[PDB]
Amino acid sequence: MEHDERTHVPVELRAAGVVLLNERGDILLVQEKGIPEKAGLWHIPSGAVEDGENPQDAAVREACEETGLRVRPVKFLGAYLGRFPDGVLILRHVWLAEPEPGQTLAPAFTDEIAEASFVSREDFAQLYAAGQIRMYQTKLFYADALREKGFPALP
Amino acid sequence: MEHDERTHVPVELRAAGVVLLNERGDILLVQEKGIPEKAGLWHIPSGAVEDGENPQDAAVREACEETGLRVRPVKFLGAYLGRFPDGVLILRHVWLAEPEPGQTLAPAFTDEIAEASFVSREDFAQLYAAGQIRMYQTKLFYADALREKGFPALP
Ligand SMILES: Nc1nc2c(ncn2[C@@H]2O[C@H](COP(=O)(O)OP(=O)(O)NP(=O)(O)O)[C@@H](O)[C@H]2O)c(=O)[nH]1
Ligand SMILES: Nc1nc2c(ncn2[C@@H]2O[C@H](COP(=O)(O)OP(=O)(O)NP(=O)(O)O)[C@@H](O)[C@H]2O)c(=O)[nH]1
Ligand SMILES: [Mg+2]
Ligand SMILES: [Mg+2]
């Protein structure tokens, strides 16, 4: 910052993801694989930022790795901080993104990902109310993205 | 985010700024006004992000407010965390930016800003060695910006 003294707060982990909207304002979400009979929760395409690599590039890379979609970062939306039980800090970065044209959703099925898909604003609202969105920040950023693009707001 | 539980670490303040490079790779820096007064230290154009407002837009706004230059954010470079003595956290955001053409540097002289100017890579290296760069992160991000644009690295 400026001249008022402050100490450094080391952030060991950083993650980057995107709020990817299509032409209708639907959001691209990734689902966790399980949790016995409960479905895994949903989150935005996002993954770890390699130490030293640009978080913006990581967001783009991760989106493609998880959904098979090449995306273009449109605008930075925000970053927020979390702390694991052991004290490790993680800074999550989020960008508004748009998919490049002529692509087919093809999720990467792993022990961490069950699938990925576009969800409408209306159904997202239901998922959120149902407690199926892992990080509530997803709703906050989806709302921001909708406003930025000029789409109607969540129900 | 991705299912391992973590707590929220509230960040009360957010700042946004830019590493603005011209066609030669010179960097735009802002100088503090004093304190034993002579020679205030240098920092990138940066200012407080209004609560709720987009940090990227804030970086662009602040750059214009402090230097008189309208700038275009080119790419996100990074964000880092600091803590004031009272415990308040501040998250600083940095973008690589380019000035729009046909502009004249016209700094905003206030009780916080002595002036602003473009400094060459060579002189920046001297300023840094001389301990005249308030936040060392400035050198780290300047280095990142130079690599991104394809300019030679700092001495
Ligand atoms: N408890 C705990 N969790 C950790 C630790 N280190 C990493 N993690 C977890 O490992 C994750 C690393 O993945 P990350 O890059 O954040 O990806 P992500 O985008 O959050 N996952 P997604 O979105 O696919 O579910 C963190 O989000 C965090 O949950 C640790 O020391 N302790
Ligand atoms: N010690 C201390 N200083 C504070 C606190 N809040 C604000 N400040 C000081 O007040 C200044 C202005 O507020 P802040 O939002 O941090 O400014 P900024 O936009 O980040 N500044 P800059 O653009 O120059 O980096 C800061 O640069 C910091 O020096 C606080 O709780 N404790
Ligand atoms: Mg990964
Ligand atoms: Mg200000």
Short mmCIF file of C-alpha atoms and ligand atoms in Angstrom, two decimals:
data_model
loop_
_atom_site.label_atom_id
_atom_site.label_comp_id
_atom_site.label_asym_id
_atom_site.label_seq_id
_atom_site.Cartn_x
_atom_site.Cartn_y
_atom_site.Cartn_z
CA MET A 1 0.00 0.00 0.00
CA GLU A 2 1.01 3.42 1.11
CA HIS A 3 3.16 4.66 4.10
CA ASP A 4 1.15 3.41 7.10
CA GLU A 5 3.12 0.37 8.25
CA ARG A 6 1.67 -3.12 7.94
CA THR A 7 3.10 -6.63 8.16
CA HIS A 8 3.01 -9.31 5.47
CA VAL A 9 0.39 -12.05 5.79
CA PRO A 10 1.75 -15.00 3.76
CA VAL A 11 -0.80 -16.80 1.61
CA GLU A 12 0.42 -20.34 0.92
CA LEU A 13 -2.24 -21.43 -1.55
CA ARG A 14 -4.06 -19.66 -4.29
CA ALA A 15 -6.96 -20.89 -6.43
CA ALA A 16 -8.48 -19.41 -9.58
CA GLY A 17 -11.80 -20.01 -11.27
CA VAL A 18 -14.49 -18.47 -13.40
CA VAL A 19 -18.11 -17.55 -13.45
CA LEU A 20 -18.75 -18.71 -17.01
CA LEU A 21 -22.07 -17.54 -18.43
CA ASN A 22 -23.59 -18.48 -21.77
CA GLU A 23 -25.77 -16.26 -23.97
CA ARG A 24 -28.84 -16.90 -21.79
CA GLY A 25 -27.14 -16.12 -18.49
CA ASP A 26 -26.90 -19.76 -17.40
CA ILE A 27 -23.89 -20.57 -15.24
CA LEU A 28 -21.38 -23.38 -15.72
CA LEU A 29 -21.02 -25.44 -12.54
CA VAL A 30 -18.92 -28.46 -11.55
CA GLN A 31 -20.23 -31.16 -9.22
CA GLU A 32 -18.25 -33.02 -6.55
CA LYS A 33 -18.27 -36.82 -6.59
CA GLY A 34 -20.37 -37.86 -3.61
CA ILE A 35 -19.90 -36.61 -0.06
CA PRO A 36 -23.86 -42.15 0.90
CA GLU A 37 -27.05 -41.40 -0.99
CA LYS A 38 -26.54 -37.58 -1.11
CA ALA A 39 -25.41 -35.97 -4.39
CA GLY A 40 -22.13 -34.05 -4.41
CA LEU A 41 -22.27 -30.26 -4.07
CA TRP A 42 -21.72 -27.74 -6.87
CA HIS A 43 -19.01 -25.14 -7.40
CA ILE A 44 -17.54 -22.97 -10.15
CA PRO A 45 -14.77 -24.42 -12.36
CA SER A 46 -11.67 -23.62 -10.31
CA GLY A 47 -8.35 -25.10 -9.32
CA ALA A 48 -4.97 -24.53 -7.75
CA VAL A 49 -2.70 -21.81 -9.07
CA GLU A 50 0.83 -23.08 -9.55
CA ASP A 51 3.30 -21.17 -7.39
CA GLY A 52 4.49 -18.27 -9.51
CA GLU A 53 2.02 -18.74 -12.37
CA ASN A 54 -0.48 -16.03 -13.25
CA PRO A 55 -3.83 -16.60 -11.49
CA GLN A 56 -5.76 -15.28 -14.48
CA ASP A 57 -4.13 -17.85 -16.76
CA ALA A 58 -4.77 -20.54 -14.14
CA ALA A 59 -8.49 -19.74 -14.13
CA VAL A 60 -8.61 -20.18 -17.89
CA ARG A 61 -6.55 -23.38 -17.75
CA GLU A 62 -8.63 -24.91 -14.96
CA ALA A 63 -11.93 -24.14 -16.67
CA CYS A 64 -10.75 -26.02 -19.75
CA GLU A 65 -9.30 -28.90 -17.73
CA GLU A 66 -12.56 -29.46 -15.85
CA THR A 67 -15.19 -28.70 -18.49
CA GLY A 68 -13.40 -29.17 -21.81
CA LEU A 69 -14.32 -25.60 -22.73
CA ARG A 70 -11.82 -23.01 -23.88
CA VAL A 71 -12.81 -19.75 -22.21
CA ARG A 72 -11.88 -16.09 -22.40
CA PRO A 73 -11.51 -14.08 -19.20
CA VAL A 74 -13.74 -11.01 -19.52
CA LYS A 75 -13.35 -9.15 -16.23
CA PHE A 76 -11.97 -9.76 -12.74
CA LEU A 77 -14.81 -10.17 -10.25
CA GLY A 78 -13.06 -10.63 -6.92
CA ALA A 79 -10.87 -12.61 -4.56
CA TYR A 80 -11.62 -13.86 -1.07
CA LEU A 81 -9.69 -15.50 1.75
CA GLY A 82 -10.16 -18.76 3.62
CA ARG A 83 -8.19 -20.63 6.28
CA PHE A 84 -7.87 -24.39 6.67
CA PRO A 85 -7.91 -25.87 10.21
CA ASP A 86 -4.11 -26.12 10.21
CA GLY A 87 -3.81 -22.38 9.64
CA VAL A 88 -3.02 -22.48 5.92
CA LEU A 89 -4.44 -19.52 4.01
CA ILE A 90 -5.97 -19.85 0.57
CA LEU A 91 -6.82 -16.91 -1.69
CA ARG A 92 -9.50 -17.72 -4.27
CA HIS A 93 -9.68 -15.57 -7.43
CA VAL A 94 -12.75 -15.28 -9.66
CA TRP A 95 -13.16 -13.96 -13.21
CA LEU A 96 -16.17 -13.40 -15.36
CA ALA A 97 -15.61 -15.48 -18.46
CA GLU A 98 -17.20 -16.34 -21.78
CA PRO A 99 -16.76 -19.58 -23.73
CA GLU A 100 -15.17 -19.41 -27.15
CA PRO A 101 -17.75 -20.26 -29.85
CA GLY A 102 -18.43 -23.67 -31.39
CA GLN A 103 -17.64 -25.82 -28.37
CA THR A 104 -19.12 -28.87 -26.67
CA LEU A 105 -19.27 -29.36 -22.91
CA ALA A 106 -17.13 -32.41 -22.10
CA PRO A 107 -16.41 -32.67 -18.33
CA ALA A 108 -13.35 -34.39 -16.90
CA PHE A 109 -14.62 -37.26 -14.76
CA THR A 110 -12.25 -37.85 -11.85
CA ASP A 111 -12.36 -38.84 -8.19
CA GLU A 112 -13.00 -35.15 -7.55
CA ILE A 113 -15.46 -34.34 -10.35
CA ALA A 114 -18.77 -36.13 -11.03
CA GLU A 115 -19.71 -33.87 -13.94
CA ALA A 116 -20.22 -30.28 -15.00
CA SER A 117 -23.09 -28.46 -16.61
CA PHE A 118 -24.89 -25.23 -17.34
CA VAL A 119 -27.62 -24.39 -14.85
CA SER A 120 -30.28 -21.71 -15.33
CA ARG A 121 -30.71 -18.75 -13.01
CA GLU A 122 -34.00 -20.18 -11.75
CA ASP A 123 -32.59 -23.62 -11.00
CA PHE A 124 -29.46 -22.09 -9.48
CA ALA A 125 -31.72 -20.26 -7.06
CA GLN A 126 -33.29 -23.60 -6.10
CA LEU A 127 -29.91 -25.29 -5.70
CA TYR A 128 -28.75 -22.47 -3.45
CA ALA A 129 -31.86 -22.62 -1.28
CA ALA A 130 -31.42 -26.40 -1.07
CA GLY A 131 -27.89 -25.98 0.26
CA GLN A 132 -26.32 -27.57 -2.81
CA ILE A 133 -23.83 -24.80 -3.62
CA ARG A 134 -20.61 -25.64 -1.75
CA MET A 135 -19.40 -22.06 -1.41
CA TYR A 136 -22.02 -19.37 -0.96
CA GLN A 137 -19.61 -16.95 -2.66
CA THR A 138 -20.69 -18.63 -5.90
CA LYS A 139 -24.08 -16.94 -5.60
CA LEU A 140 -22.48 -13.59 -4.82
CA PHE A 141 -20.22 -13.75 -7.87
CA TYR A 142 -22.99 -15.12 -10.11
CA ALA A 143 -25.04 -12.08 -9.12
CA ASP A 144 -22.09 -9.81 -9.94
CA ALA A 145 -21.63 -11.50 -13.31
CA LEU A 146 -25.32 -11.16 -14.15
CA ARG A 147 -25.17 -7.42 -13.38
CA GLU A 148 -22.01 -6.95 -15.45
CA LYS A 149 -23.56 -8.63 -18.51
CA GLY A 150 -26.92 -6.92 -18.06
CA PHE A 151 -28.85 -10.14 -17.41
CA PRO A 152 -31.86 -10.29 -15.06
CA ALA A 153 -30.94 -10.89 -11.41
CA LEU A 154 -31.37 -14.16 -9.52
CA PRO A 155 -34.97 -14.87 -8.36
CA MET B 1 -14.13 -24.33 -1.77
CA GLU B 2 -13.64 -27.80 -3.08
CA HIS B 3 -15.00 -29.60 -0.03
CA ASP B 4 -12.04 -29.49 2.49
CA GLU B 5 -13.51 -27.28 5.24
CA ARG B 6 -12.03 -23.84 5.83
CA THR B 7 -13.12 -20.76 7.74
CA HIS B 8 -13.63 -17.27 6.34
CA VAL B 9 -10.88 -14.72 6.92
CA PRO B 10 -12.57 -11.31 6.62
CA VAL B 11 -10.64 -8.68 4.67
CA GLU B 12 -11.81 -5.21 5.69
CA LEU B 13 -9.86 -3.14 3.18
CA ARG B 14 -9.05 -3.62 -0.47
CA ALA B 15 -6.71 -1.56 -2.65
CA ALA B 16 -6.26 -1.69 -6.42
CA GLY B 17 -3.48 -0.34 -8.59
CA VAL B 18 -1.57 -0.80 -11.80
CA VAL B 19 1.85 -1.41 -13.19
CA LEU B 20 1.52 1.01 -16.08
CA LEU B 21 4.24 0.62 -18.71
CA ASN B 22 4.83 2.83 -21.72
CA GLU B 23 6.15 1.67 -25.10
CA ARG B 24 9.74 1.62 -23.80
CA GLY B 25 9.04 -0.41 -20.69
CA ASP B 26 9.30 2.57 -18.33
CA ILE B 27 7.04 2.34 -15.28
CA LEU B 28 4.65 4.98 -13.95
CA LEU B 29 5.29 5.68 -10.26
CA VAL B 30 3.73 7.99 -7.68
CA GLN B 31 5.78 9.72 -4.99
CA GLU B 32 4.70 10.32 -1.39
CA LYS B 33 4.94 13.83 0.06
CA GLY B 34 7.80 13.60 2.73
CA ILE B 35 8.83 11.82 6.09
CA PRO B 36 12.33 13.55 8.01
CA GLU B 37 10.46 14.80 5.08
CA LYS B 38 12.89 14.86 2.24
CA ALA B 39 12.37 12.47 -0.49
CA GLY B 40 9.11 10.70 -0.22
CA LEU B 41 9.11 7.07 -1.34
CA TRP B 42 7.65 5.75 -4.61
CA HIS B 43 4.77 3.37 -5.28
CA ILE B 44 2.48 2.30 -8.12
CA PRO B 45 -0.70 4.31 -8.79
CA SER B 46 -3.12 2.65 -6.36
CA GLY B 47 -5.99 3.52 -4.08
CA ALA B 48 -8.81 2.19 -1.95
CA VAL B 49 -11.51 0.05 -3.53
CA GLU B 50 -14.96 1.22 -2.45
CA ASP B 51 -16.84 -1.47 -0.54
CA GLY B 52 -18.73 -3.49 -3.13
CA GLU B 53 -17.12 -1.89 -6.18
CA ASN B 54 -15.10 -3.90 -8.69
CA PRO B 55 -11.36 -3.81 -7.86
CA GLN B 56 -10.43 -3.82 -11.53
CA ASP B 57 -12.50 -0.70 -12.14
CA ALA B 58 -11.00 0.85 -9.01
CA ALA B 59 -7.46 0.31 -10.32
CA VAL B 60 -8.37 2.13 -13.51
CA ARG B 61 -10.12 4.93 -11.62
CA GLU B 62 -7.28 5.42 -9.14
CA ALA B 63 -4.65 5.54 -11.88
CA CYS B 64 -6.52 8.36 -13.58
CA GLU B 65 -7.18 10.21 -10.32
CA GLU B 66 -3.51 10.19 -9.32
CA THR B 67 -1.78 10.62 -12.69
CA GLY B 68 -4.36 12.19 -14.98
CA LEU B 69 -3.96 9.27 -17.37
CA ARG B 70 -6.83 7.16 -18.67
CA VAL B 71 -5.58 3.57 -18.67
CA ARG B 72 -6.69 0.18 -19.96
CA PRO B 73 -6.28 -2.90 -17.77
CA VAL B 74 -4.43 -5.51 -19.83
CA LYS B 75 -4.00 -8.44 -17.46
CA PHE B 76 -4.29 -9.25 -13.76
CA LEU B 77 -0.84 -9.67 -12.20
CA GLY B 78 -1.60 -10.57 -8.61
CA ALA B 79 -2.94 -9.75 -5.18
CA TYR B 80 -1.20 -9.82 -1.82
CA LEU B 81 -2.14 -9.46 1.83
CA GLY B 82 -0.99 -7.09 4.56
CA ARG B 83 -2.04 -6.48 8.16
CA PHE B 84 -2.04 -3.18 10.01
CA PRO B 85 -0.92 -3.10 13.68
CA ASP B 86 -4.55 -3.04 14.81
CA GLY B 87 -5.21 -6.32 13.00
CA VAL B 88 -7.00 -4.90 9.96
CA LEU B 89 -6.32 -6.85 6.76
CA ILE B 90 -5.82 -5.15 3.43
CA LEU B 91 -5.77 -7.01 0.12
CA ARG B 92 -3.88 -5.17 -2.61
CA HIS B 93 -4.69 -5.97 -6.26
CA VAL B 94 -2.40 -5.26 -9.21
CA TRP B 95 -3.05 -5.14 -12.96
CA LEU B 96 -0.77 -4.67 -15.87
CA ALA B 97 -2.06 -1.62 -17.69
CA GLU B 98 -1.40 0.48 -20.77
CA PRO B 99 -2.22 4.16 -21.19
CA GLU B 100 -4.69 5.22 -23.84
CA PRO B 101 -2.92 7.20 -26.60
CA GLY B 102 -2.67 10.97 -26.89
CA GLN B 103 -2.35 11.75 -23.20
CA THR B 104 -0.26 14.02 -21.01
CA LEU B 105 0.97 13.11 -17.53
CA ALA B 106 -0.71 15.51 -15.07
CA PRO B 107 -0.34 14.28 -11.45
CA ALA B 108 -2.81 15.22 -8.71
CA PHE B 109 -0.81 17.13 -6.10
CA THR B 110 -2.26 16.47 -2.65
CA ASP B 111 -1.13 16.01 0.94
CA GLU B 112 -0.46 12.40 -0.03
CA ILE B 113 1.06 12.80 -3.50
CA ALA B 114 4.14 14.90 -4.32
CA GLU B 115 4.12 13.97 -8.01
CA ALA B 116 4.10 11.06 -10.43
CA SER B 117 6.36 10.13 -13.30
CA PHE B 118 7.65 7.51 -15.68
CA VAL B 119 10.92 5.93 -14.57
CA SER B 120 13.19 3.76 -16.72
CA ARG B 121 14.09 0.18 -15.86
CA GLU B 122 17.67 1.22 -15.12
CA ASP B 123 16.72 4.06 -12.79
CA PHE B 124 14.07 1.91 -11.13
CA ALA B 125 16.81 -0.58 -10.28
CA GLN B 126 18.77 2.26 -8.65
CA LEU B 127 15.71 3.50 -6.78
CA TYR B 128 15.07 0.00 -5.47
CA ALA B 129 18.66 -0.54 -4.35
CA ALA B 130 18.51 2.88 -2.67
CA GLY B 131 15.47 1.82 -0.65
CA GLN B 132 13.21 4.35 -2.34
CA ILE B 133 10.45 1.93 -3.39
CA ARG B 134 7.91 1.84 -0.52
CA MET B 135 6.62 -1.66 -1.22
CA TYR B 136 9.12 -4.18 -2.54
CA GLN B 137 6.21 -5.93 -4.28
CA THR B 138 6.47 -3.13 -6.84
CA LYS B 139 9.70 -4.62 -8.16
CA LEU B 140 8.19 -8.10 -8.25
CA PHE B 141 5.20 -6.93 -10.27
CA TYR B 142 7.30 -4.66 -12.50
CA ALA B 143 9.38 -7.74 -13.31
CA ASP B 144 6.19 -9.71 -14.07
CA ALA B 145 4.91 -6.92 -16.31
CA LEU B 146 8.18 -6.71 -18.22
CA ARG B 147 8.08 -10.47 -18.89
CA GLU B 148 4.44 -10.31 -20.00
CA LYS B 149 5.10 -7.54 -22.54
CA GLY B 150 8.38 -9.01 -23.76
CA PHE B 151 10.61 -6.20 -22.48
CA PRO B 152 14.14 -6.79 -21.13
CA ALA B 153 14.36 -7.70 -17.43
CA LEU B 154 15.47 -5.34 -14.67
CA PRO B 155 19.29 -5.03 -14.31
N1 LIG C 1 -7.74 -29.17 5.27
C1 LIG C 1 -6.88 -28.82 4.31
N2 LIG C 1 -7.29 -28.66 3.06
C2 LIG C 1 -6.28 -28.31 2.24
C3 LIG C 1 -4.95 -28.12 2.55
N3 LIG C 1 -4.23 -27.78 1.42
C4 LIG C 1 -5.12 -27.76 0.47
N4 LIG C 1 -6.39 -28.07 0.89
C5 LIG C 1 -7.58 -28.14 0.04
O1 LIG C 1 -7.09 -28.41 -1.28
C6 LIG C 1 -7.73 -27.53 -2.22
C7 LIG C 1 -6.79 -27.21 -3.37
O2 LIG C 1 -7.55 -27.09 -4.57
P1 LIG C 1 -7.84 -25.70 -5.27
O3 LIG C 1 -6.69 -25.30 -6.12
O4 LIG C 1 -8.32 -24.71 -4.26
O5 LIG C 1 -9.10 -26.09 -6.20
P2 LIG C 1 -10.67 -25.83 -6.18
O6 LIG C 1 -11.06 -25.03 -7.36
O7 LIG C 1 -11.00 -25.19 -4.88
N5 LIG C 1 -11.48 -27.19 -6.27
P3 LIG C 1 -12.97 -27.18 -7.01
O8 LIG C 1 -13.31 -26.19 -7.46
O9 LIG C 1 -12.63 -28.41 -8.34
O10 LIG C 1 -13.68 -28.28 -6.10
C8 LIG C 1 -8.16 -26.31 -1.40
O11 LIG C 1 -9.31 -25.70 -1.98
C9 LIG C 1 -8.42 -26.88 -0.03
O12 LIG C 1 -9.78 -27.30 0.03
C10 LIG C 1 -4.52 -28.31 3.89
O13 LIG C 1 -3.39 -28.18 4.38
N6 LIG C 1 -5.58 -28.66 4.73
N1 LIG C 2 -2.40 1.23 10.97
C1 LIG C 2 -3.48 1.33 10.18
N2 LIG C 2 -3.43 2.04 9.08
C2 LIG C 2 -4.60 2.02 8.41
C3 LIG C 2 -5.77 1.37 8.76
N3 LIG C 2 -6.76 1.61 7.81
C4 LIG C 2 -6.18 2.37 6.93
N4 LIG C 2 -4.87 2.66 7.22
C5 LIG C 2 -3.98 3.51 6.42
O1 LIG C 2 -4.84 4.38 5.69
C6 LIG C 2 -4.44 4.42 4.30
C7 LIG C 2 -5.63 4.63 3.41
O2 LIG C 2 -6.50 3.50 3.50
P1 LIG C 2 -6.36 2.23 2.57
O3 LIG C 2 -7.69 1.71 2.19
O4 LIG C 2 -5.39 1.26 3.18
O5 LIG C 2 -5.63 2.88 1.28
P2 LIG C 2 -5.13 2.37 -0.13
O6 LIG C 2 -6.09 2.75 -1.18
O7 LIG C 2 -4.89 0.91 -0.02
N5 LIG C 2 -3.72 3.11 -0.32
P3 LIG C 2 -2.73 3.01 -1.57
O8 LIG C 2 -3.52 3.12 -2.87
O9 LIG C 2 -1.77 4.17 -1.47
O10 LIG C 2 -2.05 1.67 -1.50
C8 LIG C 2 -3.70 3.10 4.07
O11 LIG C 2 -2.72 3.25 3.05
C9 LIG C 2 -3.10 2.79 5.42
O12 LIG C 2 -1.81 3.40 5.49
C10 LIG C 2 -5.81 0.61 9.95
O13 LIG C 2 -6.74 -0.04 10.44
N6 LIG C 2 -4.59 0.64 10.62
MG MG C 3 -5.33 -28.69 -10.81
MG MG C 4 -8.74 7.09 -3.16
#
